[PDB]
Symmetry: D2
Subunit: 93 residues, 4 copies
Amino acid sequence: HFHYTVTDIKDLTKLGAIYDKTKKYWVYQGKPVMPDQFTFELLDFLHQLTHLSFSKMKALLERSHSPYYMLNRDRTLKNITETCKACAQVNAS
Amino acid sequence: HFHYTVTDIKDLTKLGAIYDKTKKYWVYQGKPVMPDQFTFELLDFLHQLTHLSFSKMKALLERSHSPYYMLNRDRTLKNITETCKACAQVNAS
Amino acid sequence: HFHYTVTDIKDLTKLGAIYDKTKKYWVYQGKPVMPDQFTFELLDFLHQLTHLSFSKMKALLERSHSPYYMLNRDRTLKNITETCKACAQVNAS
Amino acid sequence: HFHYTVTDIKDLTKLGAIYDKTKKYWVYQGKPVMPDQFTFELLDFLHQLTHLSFSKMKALLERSHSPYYMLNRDRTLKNITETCKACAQVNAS
Ligand SMILES: [Zn+2]
Ligand SMILES: [Zn+2]
Ligand SMILES: [Zn+2]
Ligand SMILES: [Zn+2]
């Protein structure tokens, strides 16, 4: 199941998400919430296999029928794509 | 070695390339010329592995230290990227 | 939404899946079922972006937390990888 | 241009490579030798774009007709593939 940090729980309380004891996770906009770290590890993994830019990954994810709300998705995605060495090497050309 | 079609040979003579009997290929600007068909099969293979845009593949090839002159490169490259189903599916976003 | 063929419905009835008239799709193992053709074009898209082998795509999908049941996934997946030209070119070496 | 370390020069002499003072680089099997570190950063870049296994990258490079001889290619290549996070994540499933 999901593991929420103090910072996650903090972000979630700010969003106004609610913890669901029955289903063993937090819920927001009607979806189970993906923790910040889980989201990072997932998006980082997906970028390594495709090296799609920020705009392409974002737009694809919104069409994905994802059952999850990804905490700090955009911020995490922007950080992943802008610090990718291989992509930096590509546009260096 | 390379296999040149009548149309390749046509393009090459117009370019002023020369056949090198010792090396079994045509030479131009100090570089062996890659036939139109070999160029297509190579660039298409490389795109399938990366799905880099026209601009990205072009800029990279210019930095590649490739020992070969690629016959009809841009034309072949633009066609490959503009007819890619996967890239079209990506940009559908 | 999903379009189910005669062949989908026969496979689904054979599985013992059940149709949800209210929610306008078939359900199996607690999941809405993705038709055979929709599954193919999706899995085909994912291979073009990664060119992962049969075994690797299978294992990854089983870990995917997919909200959909993919009809004839394994059979379709094998068809995709074994007819992929780019991968055929890769192992040709 | 190329920078050769003492370790490169040592490895090269063992290979029976030859230094060309006039063109100020080493030559081996009729090809200019790319230093160990340049070879690493190039091969690492290519793996990030493809994540091909050791055996496939190797077989492909042998068919590539690269204009450079890559110092310690196989050893460097195996190191690249066995320390890749994305590939490690893939078989983890
Ligand atoms: Zn990248
Ligand atoms: Zn493409
Ligand atoms: Zn493939
Ligand atoms: Zn890898």
